[PDB]
A and B are shown apart, each in its own frame.
Chain A
Amino acid sequence: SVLTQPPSASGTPGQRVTISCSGSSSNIGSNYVYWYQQLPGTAPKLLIYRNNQRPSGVPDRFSGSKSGTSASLAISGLRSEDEADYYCAAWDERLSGWVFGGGTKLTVLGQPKAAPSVTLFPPSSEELQANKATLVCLISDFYPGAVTVAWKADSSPVKAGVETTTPSKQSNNKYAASSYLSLTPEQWKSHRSYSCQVTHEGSTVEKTVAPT
């Protein structure tokens, strides 16, 4: 995404939450910002236009502002129906195109916050024998359903070969997510350690596995 938003936000029913959107002089700095709300399972829908105007059906507890190269969406009197992904968008003069923020998952809190349980699995012998290696980092029992996962080889960040699912609810209605690091067996046994790093609400759980 060319614009930058925090990946998640949350608040209790009735309180005020803000969602930020940062860009540059070529987009937000020169142009109007528009906000879209995507309820789960639905298409995005216009929420705020031209920085701070509300289309029909959008109540006045939603409000937008724009200052310099940043914009902000504020939601007061937070309600359960507000739980959704929020996107900012603007025209970019350098690109001659519309650009988006990455999206913010807004959670309207309905149960205690819960730190994730992280289990990092090394590749199995039978997959290694197929000349394949998959590190499976399972993330379980967290609320706010939003995590960021970073992978490290020894201590160097690794981005290729990574696939991470978007969190979804467990049968006990807390969230779970999964992240995969694909390696060749030559990468696996050469390094001393690979790490799965999971950040949730600011706290970071890390687990390390070694070919042993």
Chain B
Amino acid sequence: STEYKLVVVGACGVGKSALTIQLIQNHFVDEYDPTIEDSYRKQVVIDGETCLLDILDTAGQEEYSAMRDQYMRTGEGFLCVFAINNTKSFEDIHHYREQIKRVKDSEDVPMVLVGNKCDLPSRTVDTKQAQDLARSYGIPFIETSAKTRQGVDDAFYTLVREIRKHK
């Protein structure tokens, strides 16, 4: 099997944990402690290749350290999650990219932009505004819903495919 180290990043309340737990454990979490940052591991088949996914679901506080930089630099690809009904989470996306670029010491880091909670009727972030941002970064954009499982596998699998292209 081939190993991939994926990091789920994004503002509080956007669905980082709900997404991760859906991918790993195939069920939806109505609320999850926002201070709990855990790594998870799962074996899956992606485009015929048996893959070992290590997933870091980031949490806690906005705090920085040499060690946390090492935890994050371990990531090979990053899921950048915002919520479609939370305009601020989308504005924050630039901050997450710049931090990833900083610890990875590269302008070219595998990433996917995720718009979560797409099961909700009230949006404040238009699909198109998110699509343009991703195109300008040169990365995929996937809409997901951790509640309905829609797009969930596609979001993480597309990130694996992006890490593959990085070689």
Contact = CB atoms under 8 A, between A and B. Distances in A.
Interface string B43-76: 0000000000000000000000111100000000
Nearest to B66: A56
Interface residues of A, number: 2
Contacts of B66: 56
A202 interface: no
A55 B68 CA distance: 10
Nearest to A58: B67
A206 B65 CA distance: 54
Contacts of B68: 56
Contacts of B65: 56
Interface string A41-67: 000000000000001100000000000
A56 B65 CA distance: 8
Interface in A167-188: none
Contacts of A55: 67
Contacts of B67: 55-56
A55 B66 CA distance: 9
A186 to B, nearest CB: 62
- Pick from B65, B66, B67, B68 the residue with the most CB of A within 10 Å: B67
A61 to B, nearest CB: 16
A56 B68 CA distance: 9
A56 B69 CA distance: 11
Interface string B62-93: 00011110000000000000000000000000
Contacts of A56: 65-68
A55 B71 CA distance: 11
A3 B10 CA distance: 45
A56 B66 CA distance: 7
B9 to A, nearest CB: 20
A121 to B, nearest CB: 54
B50 to A, nearest CB: 26
A55 B67 CA distance: 7
Interface in A120-142: none
A56 B60 CA distance: 16
Nearest to B65: A56
Nearest to A55: B67
A118 to B, nearest CB: 48
A62 to B, nearest CB: 15
Interface string A81-108: 0000000000000000000000000000
A55 B65 CA distance: 10
Interface in A21-55: 55
A29 B65 CA distance: 32
Nearest to A56: B67
Interface in A182-206: none
A199 to B, nearest CB: 41
A55 B69 CA distance: 12
A56 B71 CA distance: 12
5 contacts: A55-B67, A56-B65, A56-B66, A56-B67, A56-B68
- Return the 5 tightest CB-CB contacts between A and B, nearest first: A56-B67, A56-B65, A55-B67, A56-B66, A56-B68
